[PDB]
Amino acid sequence: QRAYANVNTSLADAMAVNILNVKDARTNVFWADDAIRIVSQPIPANHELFAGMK
């Protein structure tokens, strides 16, 4: 399991979190490619139950 460890230290008891949004500024986004998957899937209207329409 230790092969997956991305952090050196587990969370303590009383520990200050830091919110990094102090302003409304508009984003600039960057990622390595294949970080966003777009899943698709057909709608099967050709079936004979739908026969009343093209």
Added chain:
Amino acid sequence: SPTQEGWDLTDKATGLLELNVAVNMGEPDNDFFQLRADDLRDETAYRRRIQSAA
């Protein structure tokens, strides 16, 4: 037919009578269901209920 005994039988002549029975028809029987388009991606369940209605 009725019958009556005796020789005389003046103006006792019977009339004919014949009766009736009326056959009838009833309201039709149905199995009625609907499937949205995204449910036809497998017909395997749609093919069963048609059988189940028969």
